[PDB]
Symmetry: D2
Subunit: 319 residues, 4 copies
Amino acid sequence: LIICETVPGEAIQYSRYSLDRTSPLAGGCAWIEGAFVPAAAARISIFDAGFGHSDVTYTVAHVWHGNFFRLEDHVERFLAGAEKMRIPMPATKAEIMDLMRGCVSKSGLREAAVNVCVTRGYGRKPGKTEALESQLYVYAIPYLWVFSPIRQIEGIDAVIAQSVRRSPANVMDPWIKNYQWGDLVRATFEAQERGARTAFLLDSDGFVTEGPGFNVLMVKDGTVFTAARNVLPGITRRTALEIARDFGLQTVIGDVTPEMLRGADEIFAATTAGGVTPVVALDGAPVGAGVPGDWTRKIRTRYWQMMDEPSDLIEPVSY
Amino acid sequence: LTIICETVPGEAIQYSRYSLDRTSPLAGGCAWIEGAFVPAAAARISIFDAGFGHSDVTYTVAHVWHGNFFRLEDHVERFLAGAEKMRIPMPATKAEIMDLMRGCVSKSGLREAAVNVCVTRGYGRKPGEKTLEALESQLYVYAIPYLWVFSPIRQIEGIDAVIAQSVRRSPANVMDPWIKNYQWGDLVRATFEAQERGARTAFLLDSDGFVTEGPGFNVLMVKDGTVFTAARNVLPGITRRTALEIARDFGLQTVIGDVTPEMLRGADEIFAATTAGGVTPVVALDGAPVGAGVPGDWTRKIRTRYWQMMDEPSDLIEPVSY
Amino acid sequence: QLTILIICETVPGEAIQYSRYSLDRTSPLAGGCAWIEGAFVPAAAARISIFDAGFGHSDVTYTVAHVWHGNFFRLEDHVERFLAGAEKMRIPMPATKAEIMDLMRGCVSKSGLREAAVNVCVTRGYGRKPGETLEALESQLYVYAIPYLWVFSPIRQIEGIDAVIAQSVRRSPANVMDPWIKNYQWGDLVRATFEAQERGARTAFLLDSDGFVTEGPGFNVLMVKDGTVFTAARNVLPGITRRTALEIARDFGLQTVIGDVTPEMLRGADEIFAATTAGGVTPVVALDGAPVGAGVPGDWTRKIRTRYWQMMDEPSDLIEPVSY
Amino acid sequence: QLTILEALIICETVPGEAIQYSRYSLDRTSPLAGGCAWIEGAFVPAAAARISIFDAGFGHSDVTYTVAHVWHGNFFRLEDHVERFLAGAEKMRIPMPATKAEIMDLMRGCVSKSGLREAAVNVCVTRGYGRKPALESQLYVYAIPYLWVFSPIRQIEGIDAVIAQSVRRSPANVMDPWIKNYQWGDLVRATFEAQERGARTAFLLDSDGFVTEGPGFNVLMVKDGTVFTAARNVLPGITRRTALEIARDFGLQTVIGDVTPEMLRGADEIFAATTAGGVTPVVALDGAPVGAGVPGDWTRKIRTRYWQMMDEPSDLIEPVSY
Ligand SMILES: *C(=O)c1c(COP(=O)(O)O)cnc(C)c1O
Ligand SMILES: Cc1ncc(COP(=O)(O)O)c(C=O)c1O
Ligand SMILES: Cc1ncc(COP(=O)(O)O)c(C=O)c1O
Ligand SMILES: Cc1ncc(COP(=O)(O)O)c(C=O)c1O
């Protein structure tokens, strides 16, 4: 089922530096039950209901060129989903941001993926009081790619999965970022069996939702369409839609049919682990012209250039 | 959200009378983690195991009662088959798994225990990676004191339930309940709804409106000489399997097949079945009594025979060598 | 017994009043007139072949446009939705948009009815038409104009109705038979009506597979919360009464959102109302035995209802007087 | 263009095989010869049978029905059909305006007056169009020449099918396929999909991904000596019922229960079952051969036995008095 090669001349470029590895936390740092530890050594109690019940939600913020991107938006969504899942939060928004910034700073990574999750926990904590049994776990590790940097430029192929559907809103809601990947994993297997890189899942009514780790967007005659129901409201998606509106395009978050996809001018995936990815073939047929689309490239370009432009959306890490 | 427990004096559920020597640190609860038997309270897994971040894991729970394993072989076979269906390579043989489970219980000293075994997709190549295609999957095992979904008292006196209206069971073509798994998002939602509606538990319906199971147990009903229980969108429970064997031995018909809410509302009796507690009468449903509103005759006979099977020599029990 | 639905009682002084006139019954078409297989016929004589696939397969779609005070309301909107659904259903249309509107105008005119419901439907047909060619379409267009129909009575339009969220039935999915196409497949909707009756309410709202609010039997469901009007996007007919209510709402300065509606949204709503050509705008004053907001017809609902009926007497691109 | 039935009096059949029409002459001086309906109290020529446009059976599809057939002048399972018909009308809550005996007499009369020795006989009941010219339900009956979903040649040579991916079968908790009904929106969509993909017909899945039925027929499969067919979200067909009786008489096991696409793709044989044509081999599915790719061995024996039952005196047949 640390730094990476990227396309010369294109918008995705790691930082040019070298990491001080005297620190055992350099390269990847987790925070577990009050301790900053080397990511490789980070372990959780097997009795955490985050494991045995998948009673856990999370988000992933990224750092690029030493800048957090939309860290505040991420933690607010993380917090809103934990409230929806009814998991009490054992730390404030400010505290969580500080723990994430601490994991990144300690790791020294300028290109990084920062996971924070909260679990229902494993019962009373070692040692207090009504005191919360929820557990926060954080880690900052090298930036993750669902699709490689080369494919961020050259594009991927996809299928509409036929053997599995996305988890319904009234079973376990994709709106809450969650670790229940049973359907997403099955869809990844199906993609492999059919010779594609990834799969889009349909919901029970047959509408297009998302894929294993990314939102799905399409462009058609000057409008960008993306699903409202049975998907995570991704923050890459939010950015792409803000970019598209700046470019004068219209945006619609609403029901997306497979016929809409098949007729689309352009399709692309969006996720914090990779950014904006052209999808150039669907179910064996070309998407539009079969090459990364015009709007796709100009949205992807703007996305990466934002990593370096001062704005309310970026926050430099203090290392 | 919701070593010895109080039991009802004189009824069929009684713990072993004994003293547990605590000289060994494994006594009271023992886990097997990455090649080592450790005390349960110290059992920890890598946060990077996909069994966590993707719930890429399946498991079973077999129990020990009066120092006897109950249907250990059936549990391991089912566990192995679900792992195959989930496409998780198994890093152990059936015989190996059974010996780790016996070892955890033996080292724990517990005569009444719950024994969990699960396999996850793993966290990448194991430490001491010695080749690329050595299996990355992880097997974790633990034996801890026997767990009760419903208390020993409720096993005798019964519980009340609701049919959930705010959540449905995971469909077979999303993540199949037939594979025992840790994706409890819907089961936890149903637990919250029960609490908000003032009932002990909830039964979930599937997308077509049929009765499936609840949070940690199968649902069975009795009507005019037949025991009915869902086929689709449920775990094929081994407590359910035993209850149906017992029913047929009592002369009743058994039907594994679609169960409707109207069937439940007309039932003579309803009961829950799970390894974590056995056979539990369900005496009220959506605030209305089930049958005569007390534990039914067949439920009580099945429950009694079930616990007696923990003592009676059979192919179903395997005594633990402490 | 099931209750889905020339002059009926209305509330005196309120915005709903029939025309005061005398219908002359000399022409046998007066009071109700259908067009069936090239012929205008009295409504009571209107019959179709039992072998029409619109019956045996429900291979049929339709719309109902209404006449009030002798004015057609949004006739062209209706025929445009009608045609678009028939194309979605792949039923070839045996007439042009213009021809359809003329037939509908014909039926109303010949009926004499100043308050009427005008149904046009197209079926896959019963095979080769009498008098034929494999060339010729087999689809059948049927039309009728009969006295105006009320899902909820004129008095309930003023005083309000009570509803339940159905728990024993769900709305047909988009990938089974799409509610977006107005259709005659009312299996789920009839089940929901019976459940309403069993639970002591006037009607029921159906949820879809994912547990979201859709529509009721013959009407759309709208709600008002803190200055915004909400109504479902998916698994509903895009009603033209709904379309009109939203237009009115935005001219009152309210926001509007067509999109997913949850049961919890409804349970917190300030107001709830139904919308349909067969009766207009209906207050929903109790849901699942609980009061909706204050439990009386709500402020905005009453303004929207009032304005809707006023629009029947206001020349505009939306109303076309009937030539009697 | 929609093709639901391939073969709308006598049709061409495979010489020497089990399906053969009667050789007789129709007395056509009667207006009813060749097709006779009963509508609102009168027998009328089928081609002039018309119903009120205001019948809720049209405007709401508030209607259920069955079709029993006559072969070689014998009604086949007439009583079973009327009993299924009546039970579905009760489930749909449509009052029945005639007795079981009165229905069977009207069906027999329509056949007798038609003179058809091979006939399809439809009986339906609708909610009606209001107070009649008390109870408003309407019964309509017609006997017309026997109808073929698949032609007599393909009853022998077999057909090809696809599993529909563009549409799903109506759920039990929307409009239950268990009640035979005229709501074919989904079945028509599946028929168009079959046509687009170059196959003669399609099988529909339900919400959970299980195999249900097709447009006008049940789906059965054979694997290693057992016949499987869906339980949920299908009509409990009487051809299906007959085929499973024959299978059991032949010594095969029969299982009415959940059928997966994987099971179909693995089957030894697949066949369709319906009153409009009988038992049809399905020799290709999604462009792959079913089993060996020829009409299967058990399919052929069941089909042969089915047609021989049209002539063998038994509780299954009753001769029609013309
Ligand atoms: C029509 O009766 C109908 C509506 C309302 O749509 P209009 O406002 O009349 O266009 C809504 N939902 C259903 C199922 C209907 O049949
Ligand atoms: C299921 C799913 N959809 C979409 C996303 C991406 O959303 P975001 O842009 O906030 O990372 C994720 C992240 O991996 C995801 O898990
Ligand atoms: C969802 C679910 N259903 C049913 C069961 C009961 O199965 P068994 O009797 O094999 O323990 C379990 C727990 O044991 C379960 O988690
Ligand atoms: C949907 C459906 N399934 C199955 C069947 C077959 O049922 P029977 O064998 O009783 O005719 C029919 C008959 O046309 C049908 O309409």
